[PDB]
Amino acid sequence: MREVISIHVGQGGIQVGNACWELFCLEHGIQPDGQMPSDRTIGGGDDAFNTFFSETGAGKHVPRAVFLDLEPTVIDEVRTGTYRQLFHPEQLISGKEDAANNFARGHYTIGKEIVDLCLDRIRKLADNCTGLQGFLVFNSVGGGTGSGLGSLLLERLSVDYGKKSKLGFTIYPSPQVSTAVVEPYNSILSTHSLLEHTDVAVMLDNEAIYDICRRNLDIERPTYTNLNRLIAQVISSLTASLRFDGALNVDITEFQTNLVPYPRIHFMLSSYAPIISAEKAYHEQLSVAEITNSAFEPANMMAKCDPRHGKYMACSMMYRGDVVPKDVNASIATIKTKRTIQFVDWCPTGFKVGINYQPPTVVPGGDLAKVMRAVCMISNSTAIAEVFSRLDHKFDLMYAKRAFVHWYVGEGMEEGEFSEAREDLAALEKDYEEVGIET
Amino acid sequence: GQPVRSGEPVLIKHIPTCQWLATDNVQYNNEFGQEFEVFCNSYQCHNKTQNLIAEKVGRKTIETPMRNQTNQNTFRIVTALYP
Amino acid sequence: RDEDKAFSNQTEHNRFMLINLERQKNRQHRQRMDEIKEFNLLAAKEQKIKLKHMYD
Amino acid sequence: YNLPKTVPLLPGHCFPDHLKESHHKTQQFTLVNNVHCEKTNYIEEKNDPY
Amino acid sequence: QYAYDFNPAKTQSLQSRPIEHNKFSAWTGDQLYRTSYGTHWTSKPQEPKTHVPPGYA
Amino acid sequence: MSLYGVGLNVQVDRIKTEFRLYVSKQKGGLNVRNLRRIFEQLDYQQNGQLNLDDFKAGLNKFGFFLKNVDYQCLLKYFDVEQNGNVNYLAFLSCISQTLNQRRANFVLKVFDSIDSEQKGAVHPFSLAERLEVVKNKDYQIGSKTREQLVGEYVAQFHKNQDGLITRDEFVSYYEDLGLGISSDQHFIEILQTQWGIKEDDDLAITKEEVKGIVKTIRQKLIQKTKGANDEFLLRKLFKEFDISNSGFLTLDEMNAMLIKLEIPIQKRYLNAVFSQLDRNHSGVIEFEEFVYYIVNDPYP
Amino acid sequence: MREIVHIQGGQCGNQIGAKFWEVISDEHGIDPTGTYHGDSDLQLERINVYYNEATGGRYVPRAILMDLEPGTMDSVRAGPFGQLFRPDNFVFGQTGAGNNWAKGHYTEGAELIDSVLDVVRKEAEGCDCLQGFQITHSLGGGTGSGMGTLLISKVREEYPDRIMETFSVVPSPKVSDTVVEPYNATLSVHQLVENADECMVIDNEALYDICFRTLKLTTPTYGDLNHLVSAAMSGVTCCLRFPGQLNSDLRKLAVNLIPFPRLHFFMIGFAPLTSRGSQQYRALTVPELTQQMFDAKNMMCAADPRHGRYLTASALFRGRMSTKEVDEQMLNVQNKNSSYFVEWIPNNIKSSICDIPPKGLKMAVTFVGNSTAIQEMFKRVAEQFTAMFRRKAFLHWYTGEGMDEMEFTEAESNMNDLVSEYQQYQDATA
Amino acid sequence: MREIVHIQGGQCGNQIGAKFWEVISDEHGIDPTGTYHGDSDLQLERINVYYNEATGGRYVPRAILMDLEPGTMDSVRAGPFGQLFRPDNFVFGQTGAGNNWAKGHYTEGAELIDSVLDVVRKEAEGCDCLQGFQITHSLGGGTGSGMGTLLISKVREEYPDRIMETFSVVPSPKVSDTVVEPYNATLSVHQLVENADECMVIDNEALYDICFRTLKLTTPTYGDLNHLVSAAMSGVTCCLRFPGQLNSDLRKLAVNLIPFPRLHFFMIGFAPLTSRGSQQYRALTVPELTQQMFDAKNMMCAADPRHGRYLTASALFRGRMSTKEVDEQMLNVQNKNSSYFVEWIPNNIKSSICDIPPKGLKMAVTFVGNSTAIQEMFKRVAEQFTAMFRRKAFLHWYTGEGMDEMEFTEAESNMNDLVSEYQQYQDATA
Ligand SMILES: Nc1nc2c(ncn2[C@@H]2O[C@H](COP(=O)(O)OP(=O)(O)OP(=O)(O)O)[C@@H](O)[C@H]2O)c(=O)[nH]1
Ligand SMILES: Nc1nc2c(ncn2[C@@H]2O[C@H](COP(=O)(O)OP(=O)(O)O)[C@@H](O)[C@H]2O)c(=O)[nH]1
Ligand SMILES: Nc1nc2c(ncn2[C@@H]2O[C@H](COP(=O)(O)OP(=O)(O)O)[C@@H](O)[C@H]2O)c(=O)[nH]1
Ligand SMILES: [Mg+2]
């Protein structure tokens, strides 16, 4: 009776969903058909899969997920790919025309004919769940239907359900690495839209992950499959407490109650440790003291942001494996003593710890090593203010000459949205500054 | 508390002294030709092990030995071949 | 009889210490074996992904 | 004498062990229609010609 | 020597211990035994009547 | 009281001490042999097994009462086959002493005095003759029905198939009587008054007396000549009279030798130190060992 | 006769209750299936204090387990000794608390507590002559610190004559387990000081210190911590279950321990505790027991006793021991450390004796003492609360459920006045 | 019953302490396990002097092992007889002194001595009637000198009435181990004069001379050297543990050896000493023992007593003997060598008799005397100190942690008065 429903919108969400859902299938022992292995013959079947999977009454399991996209290419791959018979046929919604990197296209003119279909499917899944903890969403901010539909769905969910917790794993554009040209335009438009509609947001830009794989996994030419495997591991550790018993359990609802000092301050960046290949795993002892220090390294963060340039407001970390309450306490005390890491003055108590017993699982054909301990750390800091400023500068550079705006204003949106969205972002930039100064 | 078998290498130690019976290549002269000497000494390894810090943390305990020995303390009981 | 009670009762503590020490010695042996277990698979997978990196 | 065959539990002598193959949690308690309910495990019979 | 055991006296669960069988009338050796008379001279159910006096209704 | 582990041994020891204390205090007509002759009536089938109720009833009849919990411990300890019934034979097997050596010495010599014809068995009337003679000076040898009239002083014992009592039971009955009485002097006085026989060793040389004697020997030597000497002096007597040059010392030679150096030890005292000094028990002691013990010994 | 019902909530409460019930079952010789298998008669006379009776001769504890989420309840049901609790004593919600005092005390616990109040009313009416209640919960958590405190309040106006006992795991800032812990801690303390009859503070730092420096075991676990807590719990009430030279129940303990009604916060400690590798050198004597009793590092709280003065103290001894030895040791330790005891009360130590030691041991003791040194914890919690409340960070989460800052201000003022009056008696002289 | 506790400081103290406990255990027949297996009952009557009773009837020594670095104590624990010492009696740090007096007395000793001070306070509390202390350490080391002498100051303040003994091994300048010897030797003496009831000076040169010349050992080792010290240590308190014709404890020796409180520096000797090849040819008698007792080559110090006057002396006799020869031997040696005895105290010799000789010997004698010839050892120490101090060599290490040159001036200043005090009480005549 602890169910979470995940939303995957856009190509970034769907390709993350493929890697995310192959891990859950292997973790809980489900074959690509939704059926348990034919031989099996153990008995005492444990229904820990109810968090993500649903029983059909006799036979297969159907995930509690929905996929949205306007281009039919990626969905048709899923419907033809390895897991064709896993997902329900009518929970894979596909459009006919792409958004074409335009926020207005997927928010005003063509996104209104699909949003009705998804809300019907969401209601059916939610009515099935009896202990729904909340929603998870996966979207790419620098995209058309990723930010268009993603903003529209979040707005609709706010009035349809309300107090239900919603978590957001957005993918912000890299500081210098870029695939498109108009990312800053729809980055702010989406961020302003989801500013008052999401509860917790996690930054998942790409350049940070590229650096991590090169530095740690000794991979000189990574691909998107490698990146989506790392992100899925973050999700698994994040929700591992709802299906595996531990010494100290944590819940989805006990994240937005501790990491959010104020309603407008809910942006945070994540870190994971140990992200290590077996080259260096054969040598390191990988103690709990060592892993908890490596989680605080700025080079190990999942977002292109330096915490050394700002203060820490709150940090939450989850341990899974064979950790002991002795060494978690001892190592945490050392972190507080360290001068290189500092907290804001009005927050003397600044941690939350969760302990789980299940060691992380390993995916065949994967890149990570098999370990006994792991930690996932979600911290809210003031240093996120720099990513908005750098993203703001590029927008102001284009918007001076009103470039590319005819591609937007002719698709149902008014000219005034650009100013107010920029206006809203400007207030937030030094809003993080006001909270970070001493009393 | 386990039975002692005849033939395998064993250790003989004195209880008031905790010193293992030993014999080395030390010459001695007597009417019965040339023979060596028998004494008591613990031929332990020279390398030291941080046992005290292990005890305070709680990793090892005193009765379990920590330092190896040299084969000069090894003795074997030999019995008759035929009944 | 008081002398007998002292000897009879202290013997319980003697057995008591042996049980704990023996089982604690057992636990470390199992846990150490699990550390050998991890590096067993990791050693194979190093020689594994080495060939995979050459292609593709 | 009569020495105990097994160690008795004491404030620091139980020592739970958690080195299992899989640490899975079973959902035995469920709240449906604002009514408490639990699974009927440890009670099932199998068959007979009765 | 050995760890700590939970179950004493080796009490096997009745789940696997034999099978249900016809003893449902174990208590009902005195179940149709009313007590208005009875428990005054006898403790077991009274025999079926063979004779009745006038006005037995 | 929390008879989890060793507690079974402690509580049953407490019960045994309490029973011994009770019986010794009353000291009178009650006897441990009286208890065993009560059980078999409740035993019925002579199986040797009794339930908790019958066991409690029998003990209460004797006049012994314990806690309600204390009865549980006895049953738990003495129900060896776990049939729910105590073993009174095992219970009476315990709480029974082996009798002191001095008491055994006195009981054996009385039996020897009675049995002057050395068969090891004594006719019942021969005993009863003595018990009646000591009780009065005017009983006279002859009686009308003397055998049956005087046999009531006896038959507290038991006789074998032949009809005579054995030495084994004669001691066995008296050691049973040795539980109601816990005073050695009172036991000896009772036996001697009953049997008209009062013969026993006066005493035995104690460790304190031996230490005093040996300290007297070692101190007397030091007064002679000087510190480095007196070893030659001690060896000189052996040189003067040890003709066979074997190097062994005898009790007669040691006595005479100690007579020479103004030390007249009593024969009983000299025997005690002689016996303590040697452990081979052939009556001969090496002179080197003797001089070592006398001179070069750190402890008194 | 004078039975007590056990009610508990929260994750920590559920775990502590599970360990305590396992310890009690072992002590009374109850198998996991619930059938009595004791060997002595003394283990059956007073079983009615903690265990009820059902058909077939089995015993079920009068325990009530409550939580807004069934996670820990589900975890504890499948464990050993989990079949003793009847299914009707399990009450659970559907949403959860989220480490929020407001959610656990006003919007969810308030609407859910009707069923558990019905259950506790049924148990209290079923018992012959109730002696009191006892609580195990955590102040730093949401559902525990809210629902348990509200239930304490309600049962307090409903039964104004029965005794109250609590076992509160007060948070320590060294283990900042929850960033919103000061609000919950101060609100729970403000609620608790108004109704709770006895309070015993337990700190994870103190438990870690015990398990690391005394027991010397390499891998501490919450199992061991809960075992320590459960041993401390059973020590205080052993005398209520077993005979002894001097009998003392919870009412007598309170009578001989609490000087003033607002001063009802204590620290507990259990002896003897020794390592496996060092047990062969120590002895088993009452002087050794009492010298380990008063050791500062042996306490189960962060408060250090030699920084303050022992107002009152009480000891509950288990095993066969001598009144001479125990009271002479008490008098000697009282005389030699006159600076550590307040002056205007002579003989501020109570002695209690029980003849039944814990299984596998020959002597034991439990120490409960009211010392003025606990104000350090209150001062630290209050200073963190006021520092974090000056900016009123995280306050919107609590305000969203209709709460007002006037209650926060009143709770802080009550805590400050408690600290002031509690410090005043430290310097008080005759 | 008048038991004494043992404190072992420094690397030398650990090595001296190891061999000393081996001899005492041998003298009482104690196995390394801890179970008594003696031959006579007298070996058990006074076992409480050095050993505490534990579970199972085993005995544990009441000795505290102290050092900043555990490297030295690490080797002794693993070797033979490493099992007697209770693990709670070992205290160690993480850095080490490194032959720096101030570092082991101001920086590291200050923050570490709290632990050891608590342990020794517990030991002195456990004993019914403490008789005195004894300390074995080195004045040429860092941990032995600095933290070792500081603990003497603290316990002196807490226990101002009990007697204290120190077996100080002041290193000699003929061959030296530490180049900073004069500094930490001088400062220790300044702190030791006003707190130590007695001083027992031991020199390495005398130990080497005895082995080569008296024992004729071609390859002596520290094991042999430690045994000679250990043999004398047990002989000092032999009469306290065993019966005898005349009884004398440590306090009685203090009364008859110290005319003025500042004159408490003794020098020791032990007799008899012979090689294996000469045991048969030598007859042991009282005239033979007293001849070797007063021989200058026998004494434990490099200072020659023939260059001064014996202020007082004391002789302890072990073994059964009469009293007339002992009384007259002390009288005759006093008359014939009257030039070596100061006049204003008549009959300045103390005699005691114990009737339990050491194992392997029939008679033994321990000699302790107060002679003015000990001032010569102070003279050369001051000679080396001022030669190094005038250039301020190695001074940056001492003054790098708050020590000031003002301390050095008084340390040497106090030494001059002691040297002058001995000289004035060497030529004065009635
Ligand atoms: N990290 C990561 N990012 C991805 C992945 N796939 C797509 N993206 C992100 O998606 C952004 C562009 O959006 P698209 O891939 O075109 O998909 P979209 O978000 O639905 O946008 P549309 O093309 O308008 O439908 C790129 O900037 C990428 O950062 C992926 O597999 N991993
Ligand atoms: N001693 C002990 N403390 C525990 C245990 N479980 C949890 N805790 C403590 O409880 C705190 C968290 O309480 P929480 O779970 O939020 O309480 P809840 O909200 O009422 O369920 C942590 O700081 C832990 O230190 C346990 O089994 N033993
Ligand atoms: N008599 C004796 N002296 C020793 C022994 N071991 C070392 N020493 C002396 O101790 C001196 C060195 O002392 P040191 O170790 O620096 O003292 P610490 O710094 O206080 O530990 C050397 O001059 C040695 O002569 C021993 O076993 N016996
Ligand atoms: Mg696209």
Side-chain angles (χ1 to χ4, degrees), chain H residues 9-16 19 67 69 72 97-100 137-146 169 171-172 175-178 181 184 202-204 207-208 222-223 225-226 229:
Chain H
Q11 178 178 132
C12 188
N14 289 118
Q15 306 295 350
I16 300 297
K19 286 291 306 282
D67 188 3
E69 61 179 359
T72 300
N99 290 318
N100 191 336
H137 72 277
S138 178
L139 278 71
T143 187
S145 296
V169 292
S172 62
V175 291
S176 67
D177 201 340
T178 61
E181 201 186 320
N184 44 17
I202 296 179
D203 287 331
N204 271 4
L207 294 205
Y208 276 140
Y222 289 166
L225 304 181
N226 302 307
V229 171

Side-chain angles (χ1 to χ4, degrees), chain A residues 10-12 15 71 98-101 140 142-146 179 206 224 227-228:
Chain A
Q11 181 176 7
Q15 290 189 7
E71 65 252 41
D98 208 347
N101 275 129
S140 176
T145 176
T179 81
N206 263 357
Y224 278 168
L227 276 72
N228 304 331

Side-chain angles (χ1 to χ4, degrees), chain H residues 31-293:
Chain H
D31 56 355
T33 306
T35 309
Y36 165 79
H37 271 317
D39 291 331
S40 159
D41 66 89
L42 275 79
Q43 296 200 118
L44 208 66
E45 197 190 310
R46 312 284 168 159
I47 198 66
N48 56 3
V49 181
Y50 284 74
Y51 298 95
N52 269 328
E53 271 206 90
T55 182
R58 57 167 318 169
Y59 300 83
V60 295
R62 47 166 45 105
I64 301 99
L65 296 97
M66 71 155 288
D67 188 3
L68 282 71
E69 61 179 359
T72 300
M73 310 178 274
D74 189 358
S75 177
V76 75
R77 186 80 165 150
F81 264 78
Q83 267 185 349
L84 279 76
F85 315 114
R86 179 202 276 102
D88 291 331
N89 285 11
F90 293 82
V91 297
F92 40 85
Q94 295 291 323
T95 49
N99 290 318
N100 191 336
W101 195 85
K103 181 166 309 307
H105 195 280
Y106 283 158
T107 59
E108 315 273 0
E111 52 78 20
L112 181 64
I113 199 162
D114 270 16
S115 300
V116 56
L117 189 60
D118 272 348
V119 181
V120 66
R121 191 180 290 121
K122 191 263 157 194
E123 300 255 349
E125 192 266 335
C127 66
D128 56 352
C129 175
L130 178 60
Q131 200 273 332
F133 303 78
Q134 68 173 124
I135 304 101
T136 80
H137 72 277
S138 178
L139 278 71
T143 187
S145 296
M147 183 177 176
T149 199
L150 201 154
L151 160 73
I152 293 177
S153 64
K154 316 295 284 165
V155 300
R156 181 84 272 174
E157 270 157 13
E158 194 170 1
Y159 294 79
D161 46 339
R162 298 298 188 268
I163 193 170
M164 181 155 38
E165 301 295 329
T166 181
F167 290 83
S168 296
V169 292
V170 56
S172 62
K174 277 72 55 183
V175 291
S176 67
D177 201 340
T178 61
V179 305
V180 292
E181 201 186 320
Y183 285 165
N184 44 17
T186 285
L187 302 160
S188 296
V189 166
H190 162 66
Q191 183 66 41
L192 185 68
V193 57
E194 77 279 19
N195 281 39
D197 298 298
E198 287 165 40
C199 205
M200 302 305 257
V201 176
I202 296 179
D203 287 331
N204 271 4
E205 294 293 328
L207 294 205
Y208 276 140
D209 291 331
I210 297 169
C211 288
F212 182 77
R213 303 164 67 79
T214 304
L215 294 177
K216 294 175 71 68
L217 294 174
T218 187
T219 64
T221 178
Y222 289 166
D224 291 331
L225 304 181
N226 302 307
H227 195 270
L228 285 171
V229 171
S230 169
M233 293 177 70
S234 88
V236 164
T237 187
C238 65
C239 187
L240 191 148
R241 289 176 289 119
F242 290 103
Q245 305 198 34
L246 280 78
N247 301 313
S248 44
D249 55 13
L250 309 173
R251 189 192 319 287
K252 186 183 286 186
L253 303 152
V255 166
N256 282 279
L257 276 194
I258 297 174
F260 304 100
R262 318 207 77 226
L263 316 179
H264 53 275
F265 284 80
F266 309 141
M267 65 180 288
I268 313 303
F270 178 75
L273 297 168
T274 50
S275 302
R276 270 201 291 109
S278 176
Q279 300 172 272
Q280 289 142 331
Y281 302 91
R282 178 173 172 177
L284 279 171
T285 183
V286 192
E288 201 87 341
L289 285 171
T290 185
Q291 185 160 321
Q292 198 177 334
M293 191 204 48

Side-chain angles (χ1 to χ4, degrees), chain A residues 348, chain G residues 378-389 415-416:
Chain G
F378 285 129
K379 273 193 295 292
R380 188 189 49 235
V381 169
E383 83 171 4
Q384 281 187 178
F385 165 83
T386 186
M388 177 180 159
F389 184 72
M415 186 146 175
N416 265 354

